[PDB]
């Protein structure tokens, strides 16, 4: 149904938005500090001296737990 398709798309897009913008594989779990952009996994974040979104200097990387990381989700990556 249209209803199921649209809902499935919204869920798909949310899950994709939780993936690292560099490797597109690992979940985002790192915040660039001070700027606050939260777009990389730890391994990809480690290779950046400036934020890829805003180009602010990265003073340090803070580990984070995205609030949408839930066992409710099936978080398959093809």
List interacting residues with Zn ion (CB under 5 A): 20, 22-23, 26, 35, 37, 41, 44, 51, 53-54, 56
Q: Choose between 18 and 53: whose C-beta lies nearer to Zn ion.
A: 53
Kindly state the tokens that stand for 51.
């934020």
DSSP symbol at 25: S
CB of 64 to a second copy, least distance (A): 4
In the complex, the residues that contact a second copy under the rule CB under 8 A are 1, 3-4, 7-8, 10-11, 13-14, 17-18, 21, 28, 31, 33-34, 36-39, 62-68, 70-75, 78
Closest CA to 37 of 69, 70, 64, 15: 64
62 binds, among Zn ion, a second copy, none (CB under 5 to 8 A by kind): a second copy
Per-residue b or e along 2-38, where b marks 16 or more CB atoms closer than 10 Å to that residue's CB = eeeeeeeeeeeeebeeebbebeeebbbbbbbeebebe
């Amino acid at each position: 149904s249209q209803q199921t398709r649209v809902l499935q798309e919204k869920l798909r897009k949310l899950k994709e938005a939780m993936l690292c913008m560099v490797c597109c594989e690992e979940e985002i779990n790192s915040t660039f500090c001070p700027c606050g952009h939260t777009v990389c996994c730890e391994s990809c974040a480690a290779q950046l001296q400036s934020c890829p979104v805003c180009r602010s200097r990265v003073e340090h990387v803070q580990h984070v737990y995205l609030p949408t990381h839930t066992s409710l989700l099936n978080l398959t990556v093809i």
